[PDB]
Coordinates of C-alpha atoms and ligand atoms in Angstrom, one line a residue:
Chain A
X18 CA 114.7 58.4 101.2
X19 CA 116.1 59.5 104.5
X20 CA 118.0 62.5 102.3
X21 CA 114.4 63.8 101.1
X22 CA 112.8 63.7 104.6
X23 CA 114.4 67.2 105.0
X24 CA 114.8 70.7 103.1
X25 CA 118.3 72.0 102.8
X26 CA 119.3 75.9 102.9
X27 CA 122.8 77.0 102.0
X28 CA 123.8 79.9 104.0
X29 CA 127.0 81.6 105.0
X30 CA 127.3 83.6 108.2
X31 CA 129.4 86.7 108.7
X32 CA 129.8 89.2 111.7
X33 CA 130.8 93.0 111.2
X34 CA 132.1 94.3 114.6
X35 CA 130.3 91.6 116.0
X36 CA 127.0 91.7 114.6
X37 CA 125.7 88.7 112.5
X38 CA 124.4 88.3 109.2
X39 CA 123.6 85.5 107.3
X40 CA 123.3 85.3 103.7
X41 CA 121.2 82.6 102.1
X42 CA 123.0 81.3 98.9
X43 CA 120.2 78.5 97.9
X44 CA 117.3 76.9 99.1
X45 CA 114.5 79.4 99.2
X46 CA 111.4 79.1 96.4
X47 CA 111.6 80.9 93.3
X48 CA 110.5 84.3 93.9
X49 CA 109.7 85.4 90.0
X50 CA 112.4 87.7 88.2
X51 CA 110.4 91.2 89.3
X52 CA 112.3 93.6 91.0
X53 CA 113.8 92.8 94.9
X54 CA 110.8 94.7 96.0
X55 CA 108.5 92.4 93.7
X56 CA 110.2 89.0 95.0
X57 CA 110.3 90.5 98.6
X58 CA 106.2 90.7 98.5
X59 CA 106.2 86.9 97.2
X60 CA 108.5 85.9 99.7
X61 CA 106.5 87.8 102.5
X62 CA 103.5 86.4 101.2
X63 CA 103.7 82.9 99.8
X64 CA 107.4 81.8 101.8
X65 CA 107.3 83.7 105.1
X66 CA 108.1 80.2 106.6
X67 CA 111.4 80.2 105.1
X68 CA 112.5 83.3 106.8
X69 CA 111.3 82.2 110.1
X70 CA 113.4 78.9 109.6
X71 CA 116.6 81.1 109.1
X72 CA 116.2 83.8 111.3
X73 CA 114.4 82.2 114.6
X74 CA 115.6 79.7 117.1
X75 CA 116.6 77.1 116.8
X76 CA 118.5 77.8 113.6
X77 CA 119.4 81.6 114.3
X78 CA 118.3 84.2 116.6
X79 CA 116.8 87.4 117.3
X80 CA 119.8 89.9 116.8
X81 CA 120.5 88.2 113.5
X82 CA 120.1 89.9 110.2
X83 CA 119.5 87.7 107.0
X84 CA 119.6 88.4 103.2
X85 CA 118.9 86.3 100.5
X86 CA 121.1 86.3 97.4
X87 CA 119.3 86.8 94.0
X88 CA 119.9 87.0 90.9
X89 CA 119.6 91.3 90.0
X90 CA 117.2 92.5 87.4
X91 CA 120.2 94.5 85.8
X92 CA 123.3 92.5 84.3
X93 CA 125.7 95.2 85.8
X94 CA 124.8 94.2 89.3
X95 CA 127.0 91.9 91.4
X96 CA 124.0 90.8 93.1
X97 CA 120.3 91.3 94.4
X98 CA 119.3 90.7 98.1
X99 CA 116.3 90.8 100.5
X100 CA 117.4 91.8 104.0
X101 CA 114.8 90.2 106.9
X102 CA 115.0 89.8 110.5
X103 CA 113.2 88.1 113.3
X104 CA 109.7 91.0 113.2
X105 CA 110.0 90.8 109.4
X106 CA 111.6 92.5 106.1
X107 CA 113.9 95.1 105.8
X108 CA 114.6 97.5 103.4
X109 CA 118.5 98.5 103.2
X110 CA 121.3 97.5 106.1
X111 CA 124.4 98.8 106.5
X112 CA 126.4 96.5 108.2
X113 CA 124.7 93.8 106.5
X114 CA 125.9 94.9 103.2
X115 CA 129.3 94.8 104.2
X116 CA 128.8 91.4 105.4
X117 CA 127.4 90.3 101.8
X118 CA 130.0 91.9 100.2
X119 CA 132.6 90.5 101.9
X120 CA 130.7 87.0 101.5
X121 CA 130.5 87.4 97.9
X122 CA 134.3 87.8 97.4
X123 CA 134.6 84.7 99.9
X124 CA 132.4 83.0 97.0
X125 CA 134.5 84.2 94.8
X126 CA 131.8 86.5 92.7
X127 CA 133.5 89.5 92.9
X128 CA 137.5 91.2 93.4
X129 CA 138.0 94.3 94.7
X130 CA 136.2 97.4 93.0
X131 CA 133.1 99.1 93.1
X132 CA 129.7 97.0 93.2
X133 CA 126.0 97.5 92.7
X134 CA 123.9 95.7 95.0
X135 CA 119.9 95.7 94.1
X136 CA 117.7 96.1 96.9
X137 CA 113.9 96.4 97.8
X138 CA 114.7 100.1 98.7
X139 CA 117.0 100.4 95.2
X140 CA 120.4 100.0 94.3
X141 CA 123.2 100.4 96.6
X142 CA 126.6 101.1 95.8
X143 CA 129.5 99.5 97.5
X144 CA 133.5 99.7 97.3
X145 CA 135.4 96.3 98.2
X146 CA 139.0 97.5 99.1
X147 CA 142.0 95.0 99.0
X148 CA 142.1 94.6 102.4
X149 CA 138.7 93.1 102.1
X150 CA 136.8 95.8 104.2
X151 CA 133.9 97.6 102.2
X152 CA 132.6 100.9 102.0
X153 CA 128.7 101.0 102.0
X154 CA 126.6 104.2 100.6
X155 CA 123.7 104.1 103.3
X156 CA 120.5 105.7 103.3
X157 CA 119.5 109.5 103.7
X158 CA 120.3 109.9 107.5
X159 CA 119.0 113.3 109.4
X160 CA 118.6 114.7 112.6
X161 CA 115.3 115.2 113.9
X162 CA 116.1 117.2 116.9
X163 CA 118.9 118.8 118.8
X164 CA 119.8 119.0 122.6
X165 CA 116.4 117.4 123.9
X166 CA 116.7 116.9 127.7
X167 CA 115.3 114.4 130.2
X168 CA 115.9 113.1 133.4
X169 CA 117.4 109.7 133.4
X170 CA 116.2 107.9 136.3
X171 CA 118.6 106.9 139.0
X172 CA 121.5 109.3 137.3
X173 CA 120.0 112.8 136.6
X174 CA 119.8 114.9 133.5
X175 CA 121.1 114.7 130.3
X176 CA 120.8 116.1 127.0
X177 CA 120.8 114.3 123.5
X178 CA 120.2 114.4 119.9
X179 CA 117.3 112.5 118.2
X180 CA 118.2 111.1 114.7
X181 CA 117.8 108.6 112.3
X182 CA 120.2 106.7 110.6
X183 CA 117.9 103.9 109.2
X184 CA 117.0 103.6 112.8
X185 CA 116.1 106.1 115.5
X186 CA 118.6 106.8 118.1
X187 CA 119.5 108.9 120.9
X188 CA 123.0 110.3 120.6
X189 CA 124.6 111.4 124.2
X190 CA 128.1 112.5 125.0
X191 CA 127.9 114.3 128.3
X192 CA 126.7 110.8 130.3
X193 CA 129.3 111.0 132.9
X194 CA 130.0 107.3 132.1
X195 CA 133.5 105.9 130.8
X196 CA 133.0 104.5 127.8
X197 CA 135.4 101.4 127.2
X198 CA 135.2 97.7 126.7
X199 CA 135.6 96.9 130.5
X200 CA 132.4 99.1 131.2
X201 CA 129.8 97.5 129.4
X202 CA 127.5 96.4 132.3
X203 CA 127.5 100.1 133.7
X204 CA 126.6 101.2 130.3
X205 CA 124.0 99.0 129.4
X206 CA 122.3 99.9 132.6
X207 CA 122.8 103.6 132.2
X208 CA 121.4 103.3 128.5
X209 CA 118.8 101.4 129.5
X210 CA 117.6 103.6 132.1
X211 CA 117.8 106.6 129.5
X212 CA 115.5 104.5 127.1
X213 CA 113.2 104.3 130.1
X214 CA 113.3 108.0 130.3
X215 CA 112.4 108.5 126.4
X216 CA 109.4 106.3 126.9
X217 CA 108.2 107.9 130.2
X218 CA 108.4 111.3 128.6
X219 CA 107.0 110.2 125.7
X220 CA 109.9 111.3 123.5
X221 CA 110.2 109.9 120.3
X222 CA 111.3 110.5 116.6
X223 CA 109.4 112.1 113.6
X224 CA 105.6 110.4 113.1
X225 CA 105.7 108.9 116.7
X226 CA 109.2 107.0 115.9
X227 CA 110.2 104.5 118.8
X228 CA 113.7 105.7 119.9
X229 CA 115.3 102.1 120.0
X230 CA 118.9 102.7 120.1
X231 CA 120.9 104.6 122.4
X232 CA 124.4 105.6 121.5
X233 CA 127.1 106.9 124.3
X234 CA 130.0 109.0 122.4
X235 CA 133.5 110.0 124.4
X236 CA 136.9 111.5 123.4
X237 CA 139.2 108.9 122.2
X238 CA 143.2 109.0 121.9
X239 CA 143.0 107.5 118.4
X240 CA 139.7 108.1 117.0
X241 CA 137.1 111.3 116.6
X242 CA 135.3 109.1 118.8
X243 CA 134.9 105.9 121.2
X244 CA 131.1 104.8 121.3
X245 CA 128.9 102.3 122.9
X246 CA 125.7 101.5 121.3
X247 CA 122.3 99.9 123.2
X248 CA 120.3 98.0 120.7
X249 CA 116.6 97.2 121.0
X250 CA 115.5 94.5 123.9
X251 CA 117.4 93.0 126.6
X255 CA 115.9 91.7 121.4
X256 CA 116.4 92.7 117.9
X257 CA 119.1 93.5 115.0
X258 CA 121.5 96.3 116.2
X259 CA 122.9 99.3 114.0
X260 CA 126.4 100.9 114.9
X261 CA 125.2 104.3 115.0
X262 CA 127.8 105.8 112.6
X263 CA 125.4 107.5 110.1
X264 CA 123.0 109.1 112.8
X265 CA 126.2 110.8 114.1
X266 CA 127.2 112.2 111.0
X267 CA 123.7 113.7 110.3
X268 CA 124.4 115.0 113.7
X269 CA 127.7 116.6 113.0
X270 CA 126.6 117.5 109.4
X271 CA 123.6 119.6 111.0
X272 CA 126.0 121.3 113.5
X273 CA 128.8 122.4 111.0
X274 CA 131.5 120.2 112.8
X275 CA 132.2 118.0 109.5
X276 CA 132.0 119.4 105.8
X277 CA 131.0 116.8 102.8
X278 CA 133.8 114.9 101.8
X279 CA 135.6 115.0 105.4
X280 CA 136.6 112.2 107.0
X281 CA 135.1 110.9 110.3
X282 CA 136.7 107.6 112.2
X283 CA 134.5 106.3 115.1
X284 CA 135.7 103.2 117.2
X285 CA 133.4 100.9 119.4
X286 CA 133.9 99.6 122.6
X287 CA 134.8 96.3 121.8
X288 CA 137.4 97.8 118.9
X289 CA 135.3 97.7 115.7
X290 CA 136.5 100.7 114.0
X291 CA 134.7 102.4 110.9
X292 CA 135.5 105.6 108.6
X293 CA 133.2 107.4 107.4
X294 CA 132.1 110.9 104.7
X295 CA 128.8 112.0 103.7
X296 CA 127.1 114.2 100.8
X297 CA 124.5 116.4 101.0
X298 CA 121.2 115.2 99.7
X299 CA 117.8 116.7 100.1
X300 CA 116.5 116.5 103.5
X301 CA 119.7 115.3 104.8
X302 CA 123.1 113.8 104.4
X303 CA 123.8 110.4 102.1
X304 CA 127.0 108.7 104.5
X305 CA 129.1 106.1 103.3
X306 CA 130.5 103.9 105.7
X307 CA 133.7 101.9 106.0
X308 CA 133.8 98.8 107.9
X309 CA 134.9 95.1 108.1
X310 CA 133.3 91.7 108.4
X311 CA 134.5 88.3 109.3
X312 CA 133.3 85.1 108.1
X313 CA 131.9 82.7 110.8
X314 CA 130.5 79.8 108.8
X315 CA 129.2 78.3 106.2
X316 CA 126.3 76.0 106.5
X317 CA 123.4 74.2 105.3
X318 CA 120.2 74.5 107.4
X319 CA 118.2 71.2 108.0
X320 CA 114.4 71.8 108.1
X321 CA 113.1 68.2 108.8
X322 CA 109.5 67.2 107.8
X323 CA 108.6 66.0 111.2
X324 CA 110.6 68.7 113.3
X325 CA 108.0 70.8 115.0
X326 CA 110.1 73.6 115.0
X327 CA 111.4 72.9 111.6
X328 CA 110.3 76.7 110.7
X329 CA 111.5 78.2 113.7
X330 CA 110.2 78.3 117.5
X331 CA 107.7 81.1 117.4
Chain G
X18 CA 146.9 81.0 100.6
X19 CA 143.4 82.4 101.1
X20 CA 142.1 79.0 102.1
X21 CA 144.9 78.9 104.9
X22 CA 144.1 82.2 106.3
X23 CA 141.5 80.3 108.4
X24 CA 140.5 77.8 110.7
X25 CA 137.8 75.0 110.0
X26 CA 135.8 73.1 112.4
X27 CA 132.8 70.6 111.2
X28 CA 130.0 70.5 113.4
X29 CA 126.3 69.2 113.2
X30 CA 123.7 71.3 115.2
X31 CA 120.6 69.4 116.6
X32 CA 117.3 70.5 119.1
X33 CA 115.7 68.2 121.7
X34 CA 112.8 70.2 122.5
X35 CA 113.8 73.6 121.3
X36 CA 116.9 73.1 123.1
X37 CA 120.3 73.0 120.9
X38 CA 123.4 71.0 120.9
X39 CA 126.1 71.4 118.7
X40 CA 128.0 68.0 118.1
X41 CA 131.5 69.1 117.2
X42 CA 132.8 66.1 113.9
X43 CA 136.1 67.6 113.6
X44 CA 138.8 70.5 113.8
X45 CA 139.7 70.9 117.5
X46 CA 143.4 70.0 118.1
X47 CA 144.4 66.3 119.4
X48 CA 143.7 65.5 123.2
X49 CA 145.8 62.3 123.3
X50 CA 144.6 59.1 123.8
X51 CA 143.6 58.5 127.2
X52 CA 140.0 58.7 129.1
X53 CA 137.7 61.2 127.9
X54 CA 138.2 63.1 131.5
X55 CA 142.0 63.0 130.8
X56 CA 141.2 64.4 127.2
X57 CA 138.9 66.9 128.7
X58 CA 141.8 68.5 131.1
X59 CA 143.9 68.7 128.2
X60 CA 141.2 70.7 126.1
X61 CA 140.4 73.0 129.1
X62 CA 144.2 73.8 129.8
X63 CA 145.6 74.3 126.4
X64 CA 142.9 74.6 124.0
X65 CA 140.1 76.4 125.6
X66 CA 139.7 78.7 122.9
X67 CA 138.3 76.1 120.8
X68 CA 135.3 76.1 123.2
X69 CA 134.9 79.6 123.1
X70 CA 135.0 79.7 119.4
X71 CA 132.5 77.2 119.1
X72 CA 129.7 78.4 121.8
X73 CA 130.2 82.1 122.3
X74 CA 128.7 84.7 119.9
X75 CA 128.7 85.3 116.7
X76 CA 129.0 81.5 116.0
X77 CA 127.3 80.0 119.3
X78 CA 124.9 81.3 121.9
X79 CA 124.5 81.5 126.2
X80 CA 122.1 78.6 125.8
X81 CA 123.8 76.1 123.7
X82 CA 125.7 73.1 125.0
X83 CA 128.5 71.5 123.2
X84 CA 129.8 68.1 122.7
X85 CA 133.1 67.2 121.3
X86 CA 133.2 64.0 119.5
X87 CA 136.2 61.6 120.4
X88 CA 137.5 58.4 119.2
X89 CA 136.4 56.1 122.8
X90 CA 138.6 54.2 124.9
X91 CA 136.5 50.7 124.9
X92 CA 135.9 49.2 121.5
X93 CA 132.5 48.6 123.2
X94 CA 131.6 52.2 123.1
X95 CA 129.8 53.8 120.2
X96 CA 131.7 57.0 120.9
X97 CA 133.4 59.0 123.6
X98 CA 132.2 62.9 124.3
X99 CA 133.1 65.9 126.1
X100 CA 130.3 68.2 126.9
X101 CA 130.9 71.8 127.4
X102 CA 129.0 75.3 127.6
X103 CA 129.2 79.0 127.7
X104 CA 131.1 78.8 131.5
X105 CA 133.2 75.6 130.8
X106 CA 133.0 71.6 130.9
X107 CA 130.3 69.9 132.0
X108 CA 130.0 66.0 132.7
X109 CA 126.5 64.3 131.6
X110 CA 124.0 66.0 129.7
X111 CA 121.0 64.1 129.1
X112 CA 119.0 66.4 126.4
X113 CA 122.4 66.9 125.2
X114 CA 123.1 62.8 124.8
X115 CA 120.0 62.5 122.8
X116 CA 120.8 65.1 120.4
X117 CA 124.6 63.5 120.1
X118 CA 122.7 60.0 119.4
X119 CA 120.8 61.3 116.7
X120 CA 123.4 63.1 115.2
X121 CA 125.8 59.5 115.2
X122 CA 122.8 58.2 113.3
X123 CA 122.6 61.1 110.9
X124 CA 126.5 60.8 110.1
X125 CA 126.1 57.1 109.5
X126 CA 127.7 55.8 112.5
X127 CA 125.2 53.9 114.3
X128 CA 121.8 52.1 113.5
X129 CA 118.9 51.4 116.1
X130 CA 120.0 49.6 119.0
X131 CA 121.6 50.2 122.6
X132 CA 124.7 52.1 122.8
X133 CA 127.2 53.1 125.1
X134 CA 128.9 56.7 125.1
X135 CA 132.0 57.4 126.8
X136 CA 131.9 60.7 128.8
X137 CA 134.6 62.3 131.4
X138 CA 132.0 61.3 134.4
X139 CA 131.5 57.7 132.7
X140 CA 129.7 55.7 130.4
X141 CA 126.2 56.4 129.5
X142 CA 123.6 54.0 128.1
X143 CA 121.2 54.9 125.1
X144 CA 118.7 53.2 123.3
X145 CA 118.2 54.5 119.9
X146 CA 114.6 53.9 118.6
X147 CA 113.5 53.3 115.3
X148 CA 111.7 56.5 115.2
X149 CA 114.9 58.2 116.2
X150 CA 114.0 59.2 119.3
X151 CA 116.2 57.9 122.0
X152 CA 116.1 56.8 125.7
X153 CA 119.0 58.2 127.7
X154 CA 119.8 56.7 131.4
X155 CA 120.5 59.8 133.2
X156 CA 122.3 60.5 136.5
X157 CA 121.6 59.5 139.9
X158 CA 118.4 62.0 140.6
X159 CA 116.8 62.4 144.3
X160 CA 114.7 64.5 146.2
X161 CA 116.2 67.1 149.0
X162 CA 113.4 68.4 150.8
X163 CA 109.4 67.7 150.3
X164 CA 106.8 70.5 150.8
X165 CA 108.6 73.7 151.3
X166 CA 107.2 76.4 152.2
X167 CA 107.8 79.6 150.3
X168 CA 106.5 83.4 150.6
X169 CA 106.5 84.4 146.5
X170 CA 107.0 88.2 146.3
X171 CA 103.9 89.8 145.0
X172 CA 101.9 86.4 144.9
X173 CA 101.6 84.7 147.9
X174 CA 102.5 81.2 149.5
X175 CA 103.5 78.0 148.0
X176 CA 104.7 74.4 148.9
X177 CA 107.4 73.2 146.7
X178 CA 110.0 70.1 146.5
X179 CA 113.3 70.7 146.2
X180 CA 114.9 67.8 143.8
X181 CA 118.2 67.0 142.0
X182 CA 118.0 65.6 138.4
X183 CA 121.2 67.1 136.9
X184 CA 120.6 70.4 138.2
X185 CA 118.6 71.9 141.0
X186 CA 114.9 72.6 140.8
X187 CA 112.4 73.9 142.9
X188 CA 109.0 71.8 141.7
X189 CA 105.4 73.6 142.3
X190 CA 102.3 72.3 141.4
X191 CA 99.8 74.5 143.8
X192 CA 101.2 77.8 141.9
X193 CA 97.4 78.9 140.8
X194 CA 99.0 79.7 137.3
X195 CA 97.8 78.7 133.7
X196 CA 100.3 76.5 132.6
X197 CA 100.1 76.7 128.7
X198 CA 102.1 77.6 125.6
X199 CA 100.2 80.9 125.2
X200 CA 101.1 82.0 128.5
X201 CA 104.6 82.2 128.8
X202 CA 105.0 85.6 130.1
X203 CA 103.0 85.5 133.2
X204 CA 104.4 81.9 133.8
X205 CA 108.1 83.7 133.4
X206 CA 107.4 86.3 136.0
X207 CA 105.9 83.8 138.5
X208 CA 108.6 81.7 138.1
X209 CA 111.1 84.5 138.4
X210 CA 109.5 85.9 141.5
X211 CA 110.1 82.1 143.0
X212 CA 113.5 82.3 142.4
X213 CA 114.1 85.6 143.8
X214 CA 112.0 84.0 147.1
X215 CA 114.4 81.3 147.4
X216 CA 116.9 83.8 147.0
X217 CA 115.9 86.2 149.6
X218 CA 115.1 83.4 152.6
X219 CA 118.2 81.6 151.9
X220 CA 116.6 78.3 150.3
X221 CA 119.1 75.9 148.6
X222 CA 119.7 72.5 147.5
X223 CA 122.0 70.0 149.7
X224 CA 125.7 71.7 150.5
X225 CA 124.0 75.1 149.8
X226 CA 123.5 74.2 146.0
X227 CA 121.6 76.9 144.2
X228 CA 118.6 76.4 143.2
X229 CA 118.5 78.1 139.4
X230 CA 115.7 75.9 138.0
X231 CA 111.9 76.1 138.3
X232 CA 109.2 73.9 137.2
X233 CA 105.7 74.5 137.4
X234 CA 103.5 71.4 136.5
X235 CA 99.9 71.1 136.0
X236 CA 97.4 68.3 134.7
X237 CA 97.2 67.5 130.8
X238 CA 94.3 65.6 129.4
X239 CA 96.9 63.7 127.2
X240 CA 99.7 63.2 129.5
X241 CA 100.6 62.4 133.1
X242 CA 101.6 66.2 133.4
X243 CA 102.3 69.7 131.6
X244 CA 105.3 71.3 132.7
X245 CA 107.2 74.9 132.3
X246 CA 110.5 75.3 133.3
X247 CA 112.2 78.4 134.3
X248 CA 116.0 78.3 132.9
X249 CA 118.9 79.9 134.5
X250 CA 119.0 83.6 133.7
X255 CA 121.4 83.0 130.4
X256 CA 122.8 79.5 130.1
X257 CA 121.2 75.9 129.1
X258 CA 118.8 74.3 130.9
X259 CA 117.3 70.7 131.5
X260 CA 113.1 69.9 131.2
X261 CA 113.1 68.6 135.0
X262 CA 111.8 65.4 134.0
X263 CA 114.4 63.4 136.4
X264 CA 113.9 65.7 139.0
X265 CA 109.9 64.9 139.1
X266 CA 110.6 61.5 138.9
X267 CA 112.5 61.6 141.8
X268 CA 109.8 63.4 144.0
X269 CA 107.0 61.1 142.4
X270 CA 109.3 57.5 143.5
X271 CA 110.1 59.2 147.2
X272 CA 106.1 59.7 147.7
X273 CA 105.0 56.1 146.2
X274 CA 103.2 57.6 143.3
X275 CA 105.4 56.2 140.6
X276 CA 106.7 52.5 140.9
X277 CA 110.1 51.5 139.4
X278 CA 109.5 50.8 135.7
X279 CA 105.9 52.5 135.5
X280 CA 106.0 54.7 132.7
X281 CA 105.6 58.6 133.3
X282 CA 104.7 60.6 130.1
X283 CA 105.2 64.4 130.8
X284 CA 104.7 67.5 128.3
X285 CA 106.3 70.8 128.0
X286 CA 104.3 73.8 127.3
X287 CA 105.5 74.0 123.8
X288 CA 104.3 70.4 123.2
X289 CA 107.5 68.4 123.5
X290 CA 107.0 64.9 125.0
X291 CA 109.4 63.1 127.1
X292 CA 108.7 59.2 128.0
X293 CA 110.2 58.1 131.4
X294 CA 110.9 55.4 133.9
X295 CA 113.3 54.8 136.7
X296 CA 115.0 51.9 138.7
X297 CA 115.9 52.3 142.3
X298 CA 119.6 53.1 143.3
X299 CA 121.7 53.9 146.2
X300 CA 120.9 57.3 147.4
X301 CA 118.0 57.7 144.9
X302 CA 117.2 56.8 141.6
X303 CA 118.2 56.3 138.2
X304 CA 116.1 57.5 135.3
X305 CA 115.8 56.8 131.7
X306 CA 114.2 59.1 129.9
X307 CA 112.8 59.1 126.2
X308 CA 113.2 62.1 123.4
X309 CA 113.6 63.4 120.0
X310 CA 116.2 65.3 118.8
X311 CA 115.8 67.1 115.2
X312 CA 118.7 68.3 113.1
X313 CA 119.1 71.9 112.7
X314 CA 122.4 72.2 110.4
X315 CA 125.3 71.2 109.0
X316 CA 128.2 73.4 109.2
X317 CA 131.7 74.7 109.2
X318 CA 133.0 77.1 111.8
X319 CA 135.6 79.7 110.3
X320 CA 138.0 80.9 112.4
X321 CA 139.9 83.8 110.2
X322 CA 143.7 84.8 111.5
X323 CA 142.5 88.5 111.7
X324 CA 138.9 88.3 112.8
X325 CA 139.4 89.8 116.4
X326 CA 136.2 87.8 117.8
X327 CA 137.9 84.5 116.2
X328 CA 137.7 82.8 119.3
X329 CA 134.3 84.1 120.3
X330 CA 133.4 87.7 122.0
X331 CA 134.2 87.4 125.5
Ligands
PYC1 O1 126.6 103.5 111.1 C1 125.9 102.9 110.1 O2 125.0 103.6 109.9 C2 126.7 102.0 109.3 C3 126.4 102.0 108.0 C4 127.1 100.8 107.5 C5 127.9 100.5 108.7 N1 127.4 100.8 109.8
PYC2 O1 115.4 65.6 133.2 C1 115.3 65.7 132.0 O2 114.3 66.5 131.7 C2 115.8 64.8 130.4 C3 115.4 65.0 129.3 C4 116.6 64.2 128.5 C5 117.1 63.6 129.3 N1 117.1 64.2 130.7

């Protein structure tokens, strides 16, 4: 009676280098048995309130990426997923997939090895390593423009690359900033000023793509690079910028196909990557670690005005 | 072996008018059997990492208030609670107590009625109503200053009251804004400019207290008032009912025991009364908390942010 006064959605939360992913294990309505793309179309049209319940406050946050677990079409896939966020439905998500694969191991569904995950944009290949880190083959990445110059209000001129790695990035090495975990405020201020400069100048990705991620790179004594990424807003989910960086290295002849590249973030998260050439860019494979944060049942009470999230 | 590679903390999340509260049911270390204040001291000194695990990202957020459930000292109390947030440990929390009491009902520990909750700053009285809303007796509230004149940058002059209701509020009726749910951007910009003007002018609460909550009021066809509160930042906020009551009382606009009804721009409704006390009023505020989640927080030995991202 009271029990029946609220819906239940079972979830498992993880984070990959501090970016959160929420895997919905059960509690969404049936979306039929077509491809992930077709199931996503049903979810988006018939049951979008379930996305908002899971992602929006008070149950989630604007930086949260969600993934709905689905039984895949092919029996040789470990799972099917549909990714979503506070704005809508996504295609592929790199750091999210690391979370998903780690979570599937936590649930006891898979052991170390190669696994295929169905998505609305195609089947993703991933390797679960013995240490439970995951190598994920991401979408096609490429550099749109090299050494694009602008004046950063309050700081001065800089050049950077415009690159696509599932998100539009402006990538800068010669920024004069100290890239370290104890300097995030100064870095954030710099990168925000950069994004504003791009706006003012009307600098975009291909087809007017909004460059909403800024990445600052620096030498590092232990890795090939130390980076800081500024995420959309001051809000939407954040990439780590590894794929975009690889596309620039590849285009400049600094890194061959197959060569291993190692990047660390200012908060200490480490990523190892390689790429293979493809038509119109590179296909990068990125290894990273996700950690578990919670198992939960979200509760959606009939009389809660924000039961489907606060909009 | 795998199971033992991580700590588990059982929590229940609720929200009262969109403001979230996290009740920690189990998984913190023992804090002894002293008073709530003595247990708080042990927690703050020995086990503060447990607070950060719960409140900080990735498991929590800056606006989250936490509450650790403890076995009370008095057998006349339903529970004991230690409130905390991202910056540290709190005393009493009105909207948080609404969540706690609703949550105790969800756990099957209490039925509708009057209950006492021990806190580090004293025993709070609350009524759980049949509809599962809760009336909480809050801390002493009072008005510090009446009709303070202020130049709002980019807007022009206003009068406001400075009042304490668990927090320092600047309360304004003559703001010239439309106080409605679909107009939060403009309301936010205006309230921000107000707070900035308070800073510039050196206007504070008693003992130089920082005025970090701005509340804009307006007439409402269904209620005594419609309000918009600008919260600090980011960190949690109250909804300014107690502070408003204190000004109403001081102006002879609302008698002790008379019922006042206030709606927020997002639609949350609070009913309230007060009784006179030494140095101000003791308000009792009724509101509704809804359940958000039941969860087991997981703290892996190898996760670098296992105790929160600091
Ligand atoms: O930086 C990236 O593109 C990435 C892929 C998976 C995790 N990060
Ligand atoms: O002062 C308030 O807004 C309040 C709400 C719930 C308890 N106190």
